[PDB]
Amino acid sequence: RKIDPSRGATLGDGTPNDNDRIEIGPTQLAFSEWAAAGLQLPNLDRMREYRWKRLTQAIVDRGYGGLLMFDPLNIRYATDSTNMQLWNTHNPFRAVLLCADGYMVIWDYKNSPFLSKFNPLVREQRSGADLFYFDRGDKVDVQADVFANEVRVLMQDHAPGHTRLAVDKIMLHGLRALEAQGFEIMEGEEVTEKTRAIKGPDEILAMRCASHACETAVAEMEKFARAHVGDGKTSEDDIWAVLHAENIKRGGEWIETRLLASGPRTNPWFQECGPRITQKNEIIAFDTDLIGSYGICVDISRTWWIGDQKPRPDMVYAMQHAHEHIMTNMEMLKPGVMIPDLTANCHRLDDKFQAQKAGCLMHGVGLCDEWPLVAYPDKAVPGSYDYPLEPGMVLCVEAAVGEVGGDFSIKLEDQVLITEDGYENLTTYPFDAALMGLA
């Protein structure tokens, strides 16, 4: 029973054309819009092989025996398998071990070993890596030793002679149990972040699709906002709810922040989306921070003016300054540029906007916000990110622009791929004409 009657045994991404399959993914709505937009689809099998090969090599390059992952985003990277991702983020029930020979094992939720079976690179599905008080109460320690012994045996068989085990993050009972087994615990995030920083061809294709779906969802939200803002009942939450639904309808997964705000709640930036009733002749600013189709993060920001009056002149200047900030900074991007040189040479925001500027001028992005973080000169730490940009990295380029004690802020941000030659702005979403000083 096909989900897409117009295709053969597989969908355009190589997955089975089967309405009843376990595996989820983009909806027919999403696939339809991508085809209309002329987008080439990723091949998921080749994508999954690329990530696994790259992560395996990262382990080998460091002389480690294995990498043990409890962060659901790292688990997603290694296996492309989801399972209650958001519950998993703060309940560590799940683990993946990847050994130096490429052998990969998942410890999954006891009731659902079938969820990663679609990926043959996952060689075993086990259970019992859930080492936290809710799940095991006063008997965490017993299972921690069972689990740590399993990891020892796997490492003995698939990484013999290696005692170095990289771990991204683990509960203290698990840490103690692994150390008891003889492991020297290495920093797993140094491995995962640097590995994930370079996207293969299929990941870039997935991201193009995710970017399109997100921009479409945002367009629905803009449509809702311009039609309903100022009707005396429409709140920030009402507007933001459109983005939630439109993302989910296209096979997206969640939203990381609550960064949509209206009017004076845009300054200081990082106030959260809430019940505030929106008003005519006001700024609405937001940051998608969105985990979208194929599980790819799309992290873009736009600021809107909605009203019958024109925006104030200080608003227009702020918007122009913000847009100038990200376009100038984006021009720095090409392979071989050292991250601290991005910091040293970035566009300078006016004195009045310096106190409230964003936490970085750029950061990586893939399955969520990722390494590197490109700090502004006054916050940058020498020796923290001494590495060059490379083709296949993706960076979001940020501008947060507002005065201390001001009654609005501008937030703009684009998602940019590093190419062989330089860069490609993936983001095609319009900038507000009125705020840009146009008409």
60 within 8 A of 96, measured Cβ to Cβ:
no
Exposure string of 108-142, with b = 16+ CB inside 10 Å and e = fewer, is bbeeeeebbebbebbeebbbbbbbeeeebeeebee
Nearer to a copy of itself, 112 or 419 (CB): 112
| CB 421, min distance to a copy of itself, A | 26
Show the tokens assigned to 37. Answer: 């937009």
Nearer to a copy of itself, 149 or 419 (CB): 149
Taking Cα atoms as reference points, which of 434, 413, 407, 402 lies closest to residue 279?
A: 407
Q: How many whole angstroms separate alpha carbon 296 and alpha carbon 374?
A: 21
Restricting to residues 11-50, name those near a copy of itself by CB under 8 A: 19-29
| CB 26, min distance to Fe ion, A | 23
Verify binding: residue 169, a copy of itself, rule CB under 8 A: yes
Which of 150, 203, 282, 299 lies at the binding interface for Fe ion (CB under 5 A)? 299
Q: Which does 418 bind (CB under 5 to 8 A by kind): Fe ion, a copy of itself, none?
A: none
Q: How many whole angstroms separate alpha carbon 385 and alpha carbon 310?
A: 43
Q: How many whole angstroms separate alpha carbon 193 and alpha carbon 335?
A: 18
What is the identity of the amino acid at 73? L
Show the tokens assigned to 226. Answer: 């311009």
Verify binding: residue 265, a copy of itself, rule CB under 8 A: yes
Which of 396, 417, 418, 435 lies at the binding interface for Fe ion (CB under 5 A)? 396
Nearer to a copy of itself, 153 or 381 (CB): 381
Q: 433 φ, ψ to 5°?
A: -60, -45
Q: Which does 223 bind (CB under 5 to 8 A by kind): a copy of itself, Fe ion, none?
A: none
Taking Cα atoms as reference points, which of 151, 139, 154, 155 lies closest to residue 177?
A: 151
Draw the binding track, 354-373, toward a copy of itself (x: CB under 8 A; -: no contact).
Answer: --x-xx---xx---xxxxxx
Verify binding: residue 172, a copy of itself, rule CB under 8 A: yes
Residues near a copy of itself (CB under 8 A), total: 103
| CB 289, min distance to Fe ion, A | 5
Q: Which does 432 bind (CB under 5 to 8 A by kind): Fe ion, a copy of itself, none?
A: none
Tell me the pairing of strands 362-365 and 369-374. antiparallel
Which of 7, 53, 110, 280 lies at the binding interface for a copy of itself (CB under 8 A)? 110
Restricting to residues 264-293, name those near Fe ion by CB under 5 A: 287, 289
- Which stretches of the chain bind Fe ion, using CB under 5 A? 287, 289, 299, 396
